[model samples]
Target: ITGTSTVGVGRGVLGDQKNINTTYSTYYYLQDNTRGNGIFTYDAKYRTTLPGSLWADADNQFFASYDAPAVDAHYYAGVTYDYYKNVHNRLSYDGNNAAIRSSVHYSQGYNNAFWNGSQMVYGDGDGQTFIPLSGGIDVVAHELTHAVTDYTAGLIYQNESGAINEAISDIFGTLVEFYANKNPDWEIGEDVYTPGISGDSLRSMSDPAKYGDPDHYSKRYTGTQDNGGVHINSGIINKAAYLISQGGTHYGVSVVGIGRDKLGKIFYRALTQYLTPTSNFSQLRAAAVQSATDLYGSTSQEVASVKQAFDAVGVK
Candidate 1:
């Protein structure tokens, strides 16, 4: 429906009030024209089908309990767009101003969210496990970053390539969480995971093995489940990235922290310039080294830290 752009007030899943971009076409629709191309959010109506309908509200105010997920998804999508455009200097996930879209309330007790290669899909998790996944900034970023990976690295979603892809999402997801400056930590899905638990998250980048994920290459999972351990094996890469950004010692290997900004730059460059579909752990190490060398020179501390980080993780 053709309408004028307008701003709407809404409360998110966590009861945080924020303004959202909407369109006034008799009813307020969650179509934001402010970001790259546009940021469109939809309601899945608790089904498996995609993007069921453009969310419509009689008033330009969204305050219903059912509206919580939509509000968060719409607002956070804008934040993610801002992160890419303002920080990475990239237009959108495609770097070509592609429209960003999302659908919430996907299914009952769905527990997880993902980018289905086209748009984002969020689930209203079983209350005991998760509230609404969109409520977590990191969860939203993690899903959107999948689109980023698809557009650039195109890393195959299996085995080593898949693991690298997962780590990249976690890396950027954490970076985006910090960028938003909301109780940021190097943990994935903490805000939306396990409402009954405290001081726990889906995964820990700081110490991957803390959650049973391998922090060193020797401990890497070689099983066939999880698409050849795409999620499990990612711990190795995630640990390396964390070490690069925040220095620490692992298995007697020491790394000098280069800060998150440099860590993001190096990895972004690697994902965009060097990584390929079949890139394995060793190949990723090479790509990271070259990316750091390109950004900070071969003799720079950034380059040295990249090497030490990979060594600490036993990537090489």
Candidate 2:
């Protein structure tokens, strides 16, 4: 519905206070006119339908307990958009300032989120497994990064390429978390996964092996499940990314830490410029190395560290 641009104050699923973009006419709608065409958010109301209804509020304030998921989903999408545009010089997931859209409360007790190729969809988890998936900024960024990958590299969703695709999301998702500076860590979905369990995450980048995921190439899953272990084998690449940002010794190989900013630069370049639809692990190593060299010179420590990080993770 056509309305005047407005801002709404709200609390997220985790009770964090934030301001959301909305529009005001007869009712307040979750539509942000400040960014691109607009950032649109919808309430799925625990159904499987697409988009559902644009979230509406009686007033420009969203403090109701039930409004938590929609508030967080809408706010987090703006954060992800700002991260891409300001940090990486990306206009949006598609690099053209696409109207960011998200649907919250996608299905009953759903515990996952995805990009769906066109927009973001989130689930309010089963309480035991998760809260609202949007409650975690990293998860929001991770899902949206899938759209970036689809637009840039178009990495195939199978085998090594699929793992690479997953790793890219994890990488940027972590970076976006750090960019926001909100209880930042190298773990994914930690904030929203199993709220009753503390210090545990769906996945760990600092040590992927902490959760039965491989931290080295030699231990990668060779099975045909999960699109050839797309989520499972992503640990290898995640480990390398972690080491690149925060130096560590893994598998007897040592890497000099180049910090998060440079890590993001090298990986972003590799993802947008060098990687292909079917690029494998070895190709990723080459792409990352080239990206580092392009950004920091062939003999720079950044370039050397990229090689060492890949080696530490057995990416060679």
Candidate 3:
């Protein structure tokens, strides 16, 4: 669509007021050209069909309740793009300023969001379990980070490698949330998860076991379900990431806090420079330590904390 870039004021799923980038031809469209080639969001309209129609409005105002998910989906995608570009100097998920695309209201009562190997997709949850998932910046960042992993490490999506992939998304998602500094916390999907239940999250990096996820290697699930427990076992790595950023004593093992920025630097380096498609938990430990050493030093407390964090999680 050939149009001039415009600004639109909108309310998000959580009823927060914000401005969004839009394009104007005959009607305003949710297409932002300011970021790379563009960041485009579409409406799924409660159907399984993908990338339905480009969201359009007569005026550039998007305060309608129906427009909430589209607004947040577009806004959050831009924030994620900015996160990579500003923090790591990476242009986009592909390091080439690739166009970011998202679809909201994916299906009737859809309860999840995913990367779909190309574009980001979000569900308007059953209302009890979740609202529009795009409402959560962490959830948006988490899905987009999957694209980052795909373009970088290309970690295989099964078993230990799969869990590594999931953990990497969680780790960077939390980092992105903190980067935005919007009521930052170490919890994942806290905003859009379980609207009926407060103080609960889909997962917790700080305390993975709080949600029945494994915080130690000995408890790793060996089941065949969930692609070999990719989501379930990610807790081990998530706990390690949390410990590295905020030191603590776990099961008699202690880690010194290295802070969030350093944690992000180390993990980003590892993901881009060292990890492989088939890398497992043990390999992740080596990669993180080497990443810390590369950024800090072999003898640096950053490197030591990385090692201790992995060890505390029993990654060895």
Candidate 4:
């Protein structure tokens, strides 16, 4: 399964079959981030009705027919649900009982998709440079991950906290992408964007610098735009995780031979178990190495390798 295959499923499914009308009761329940009422909505006729990909505004309306976005929304929501359950033995999004509702194709030409406090909303792209926002699994996973961040680290959306928030999303987003075995590509949003663009993705996990924008992550990277560039600076942490899992020499360390599954487990434990909303890079470095040791044993080379990766990136 690849991002292309995920898009194929989105295209094959009809619109009306996807919409899920969540109730007021459920909405209020999920406000606490624990309630076990994870319901989502989907819309099928998004592209045809809107003439492009668009997300619902604060109003949450459609142009015509009863195209449901929850259909597709739930599919990935379920995937996230199962991933946490099977891999981490966690229940729902909060580790307690929390219901999540995802509403897709909210408005016309919205371009951006996000998880707005209560539910997840997607947009139909303008079709000039981007396709439907829901066209990619990573995008969907990214939004849902915001909820996860809110629950766990409660990482503030400013400065380092903001970076952590975005990094966590990228972390789980990539995991979910690979977990689906869909589109082994490391880039995000390859399907939603038109091939007319020079690059195939919005962000690069393996090499953030490849985006041709030095602003991806740098000491000069200012905390402005996109919520302190939480979306952009995330490249740093994303690359860190990637290097640890892939066993690559990032930042000039001769890294090799670490398993992806093991590295993922280490990161998962660190983020969910030890990290706080205000944790900084130094704290994360220590926590991740400690997590690796805990999961794979202190004498394990994987733990030492992860620590080296963190130090190579100046996490000391």
lDDT of 2 by residue, 209-301 (tens): 999999999899999999999999999999999999999889899899999999999999999999999999999999999999999899999
lDDT of 1 by residue, 29-121 (tens): 999998978999999999998978999999989989999999999998898899888889999899999998899999889998999989999
TM-score per candidate: 0.98, 0.98, 0.98, 0.78
| Span of 10 residues, lowest total lDDT, candidate 3 | 175-184
Model 4 TM-score on a 0 to 1 scale: 0.78
Instruction: Give me candidate 2's TM-score against the actual structure.
Output: 0.98
For model 4, what is the alpha-carbon lDDT of residue 273? Answer: 84
* 1 versus 3: better lDDT goes to: 1
Model 3, C-alpha of 178: deviation from truth (Å): 1.0
Distance from true position, residue 306, model 2, in Å?
Answer: 0.3
Q: What is the alpha-carbon RMSD of candidate 1 to the true structure?
A: 1.0
The predicted structure with the larger TM-score, 1 or 3, is 3
Error of 4 at 219 (Å): 3.7
What clash count does candidate 1 reach? 0
Error of 1 at 14 (Å): 1.4
